[PDB]
Design a protein around this ligand. Structure first.
Ligand SMILES: [Ca+2]
Lengths: 97, 58, 97, 97, 93, 194, 97
């Protein structure tokens, strides 16, 4: 809000957004951006002190060179791996295998 | 100071001829009947590329 | 992480990437109504790198453009009609009905 | 699919070609109905395609034609429905004590 | 020809050196079996190229001339081996 | 070294390379109590684009222009792309700043990311078209060199062809004492520090 | 203007700086493709060499005007290399013992 020629600002609840684009470009919840071409399954997000949820990404080299990475699957694990959903790049969804 | 008195310099020459015959800089002679666009020779040994030559057949 | 520049490895690939990815940063283009909401510099860099690097250049270009469009939609900006000129194929591939 | 009066064998699939094994009871009372014609295979989509159109599979994951995988230092590209590896064939990896 | 301790064939190496156009997807050449097919022996081993044998080995160019003579599409067998001879002369120079 | 250090008793240190580079070191006692083009020092980087009106904006131009001393000074505009407006220099830039990617700084690549330093080097070399390309290049490389030195990496990069330093200029008649130091001499004996 | 100031005042009576100044200005105007400091250093070093040839050894190089990295040639722990305008025609070497 404007007052006396200056802006007075109040914080409001604000959801965060992480993004994995192109199989190699990562943008974290805090806005940090980087680019690593992985060849494994990696832990995207997870509580440190618990295992209520866990998101994994299967970033694999999909070309002749080592810098062509594809996101082949995304794994959502819930309640200590008691509910595992694997979504593949082909659109197939596997609930509990 | 670099000295060179041997006129034989086939090691610095690469060529293609005839029915897809390729001779590399190191003297290797092979046949690759590819009709696509290929990198004939490029300077990948440095951060900045001085040259990049590509050839295409039909 | 090395310091490769794929666009420098091919003249035609660099030309294609520059011609089709510069629409992200074009203020008077299909994506010009979003420059105030989302900064397109990172998306432009991703577009250039992906188009120059991956074998299926059109697929990676379309992925970068779609990622920018999705970010704009998340910010509340609609960029309908952005597939005219490139990425036309997915519009004519869904089932009969 | 084409109708058949006698169906005593089991329907071949691209996954059957990949894994080399099929999910079937081998011996059952012959039935009738529309099946994939002889010399044709059924993919995950649900249409009958020739052996030259069946996708490659690695670690149970579908590899599109033109894509490549990296296993134990070997690069295997999927072309014409077959996974051809650089160097002929990947030797059985040996791990030290 | 060594990707990672693996002896690459000329086909594999040539396909590895591919750089395609944006909208032009190209199919790699199909490896064909040999067709089971000596003019070049007279000239290459003759005195006409004698002053060139001592500097450039002729075996590779002999095989190249045989391939060119066998693979070319007209029965000008005397005049269908000019390219390999010209290349050998260039290498000799 | 090449730096002029202004030290204050309030906890403020300034390193000045005497040409274009300033490094302001602020003690943790000033966290959340500062403002300007250097941010507000509260460990959050997104809100550092706070204008003089105390509102965080997304436009870098607006945030920068809000902090000018004189309100009557004309506002800055977005500059042209240097390597696009001056293509004939681009190659030279890419050939000169490749020192930041070669074996010269190879030991530092694991401790300081050279991407932004390389980009700044190339852009400055492209835009240094009015005289003094070597000064632009040397400042751009010395920024990364100082970043490497701050984390304990004594990397030597100045050759007689790449940003030479005339140490012998400081040698008195018949003397040889001055030597180039990459990490410097933190505690060297002097009159103020006997 | 260094070719007209106190730096080369002593040489002005022995080498005319007219054509050297003109070449300096023309080269600095035309050195627009990158590396104008090299052009300027060469243009001034031509006049410096002309001055030095006729017995006048002026010290014109400063850390801001065409510096010379003599210290680069010092071995680890040594300090031997110095800038000489006159040069040292008969320094002692083992090719001229
Ligand atoms: Ca802040």
């Amino acid at each position: 809000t404007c007052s006396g020629g200056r802006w007075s600002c109040q914080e409001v609840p604000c959801p965060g957004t992480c993004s994995v684009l192109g199989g190699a470009h990562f943008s974290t919840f805090d806005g940090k951006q980087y680019t690593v071409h992985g060849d494994c399954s990696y832990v995207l997000t997870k509580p440190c002190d618990s295992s209520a949820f866990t998101v994994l990404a299967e970033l694999r080299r999909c070309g002749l060179t080592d810098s062509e990475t594809c996101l082949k699957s995304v794994t959502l694990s819930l309640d200590g791996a008691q509910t595992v959903v694997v979504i593949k790049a082909s659109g197939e969804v596997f609930l509990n295998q | 100071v670099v000295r060179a008195s041997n006129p034989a310099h086939n090691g610095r020459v690469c060529s293609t001829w005839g029915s897809f015959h390729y001779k590399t800089f190191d003297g290797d002679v092979f046949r690759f009947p590819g009709l696509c666009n290929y990198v004939f020779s490029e300077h990948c040994g440095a951060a900045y590329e001085d040259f990049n030559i590509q050839l295409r057949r039909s | 992480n090395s310091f490769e520049d794929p666009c420098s490895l091919s003249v035609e690939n660099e030309k294609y990437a520059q011609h089709w990815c510069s629409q992200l940063t074009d203020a008077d283009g299909p994506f010009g109504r979003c420059h105030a909401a989302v900064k397109p510099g990172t998306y432009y860099s991703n577009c250039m790198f992906d188009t120059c690097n991956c074998e299926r250049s059109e697929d990676c270009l379309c992925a970068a453009l779609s990622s920018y469009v999705h970010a704009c939609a998340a910010k509340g900006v609609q960029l309908g009609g952005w597939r005219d000129g490139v990425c036309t194929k997915p519009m004519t591939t869904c089932p009969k009905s | 699919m084409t109708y058949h009066y006698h169906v005593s064998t089991c329907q071949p699939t691209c996954r059957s070609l990949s894994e080399g094994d099929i999910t079937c009871s081998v011996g059952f009372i012959p039935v009738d109905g529309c099946i994939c014609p002889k010399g044709t295979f059924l993919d995950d989509t649900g249409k009958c395609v020739q052996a030259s159109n069946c996708p490659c599979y690695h670690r149970g994951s579908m590899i599109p034609n033109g894509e490549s995988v990296h296993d134990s230092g070997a690069i295997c590209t999927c072309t014409h429905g077959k996974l051809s590896c650089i160097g002929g064939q990947a030797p059985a990896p040996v791990c030290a004590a | 020809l060594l990707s990672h301790n693996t002896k690459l064939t000329p086909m594999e190496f040539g396909n590895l050196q591919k750089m395609d156009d944006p909208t032009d997807q190209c199919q790699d050449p199909v490896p064909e079996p040999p067709r089971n097919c000596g003019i070049c022996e007279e000239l290459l081993h003759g005195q006409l190229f004698s002053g060139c044998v001592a500097l450039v080995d002729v075996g590779s160019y002999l095989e190249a001339c045989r391939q060119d003579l066998c693979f070319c599409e007209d029965t000008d067998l005397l005049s269908c081996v000019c390219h390999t001879l010209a290349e050998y002369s260039r290498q000799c120079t | 070294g090449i730096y002029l250090v202004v030290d204050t008793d309030i906890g403020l240190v300034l390193l000045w390379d005497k040409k274009t580079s300033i490094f302001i070191n602020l003690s943790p006692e000033f966290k959340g109590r500062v403002c300007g083009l250097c941010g507000n020092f509260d460990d959050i980087a997104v809100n550092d684009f706070a204008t003089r009106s105390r509102s965080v904006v997304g436009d870098v131009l607006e945030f920068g222009n809000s902090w000018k001393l004189s309100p009557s000074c004309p506002d800055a505009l977005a500059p042209k792309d240097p390597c696009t407006a001056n293509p004939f220099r681009k190659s030279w830039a890419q050939k000169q700043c490749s020192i930041l990617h070669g074996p010269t700084f190879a030991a530092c690549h694991a401790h300081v990311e050279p991407a932004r330093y390389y980009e700044a080097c190339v852009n400055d070399a492209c835009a240094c078209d009015s005289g003094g390309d070597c000064e632009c290049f040397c400042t751009a490389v010395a920024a990364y060199a100082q970043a490497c030195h701050e984390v304990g990496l004594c990397v030597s990069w100045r050759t007689p062809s790449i940003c030479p330093l005339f140490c012998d200029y400081y040698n008195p008649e018949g003397q040889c004492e001055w030597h180039y130091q990459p990490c410097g001499v933190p505690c060297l004996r002097t009159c103020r520090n006997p």
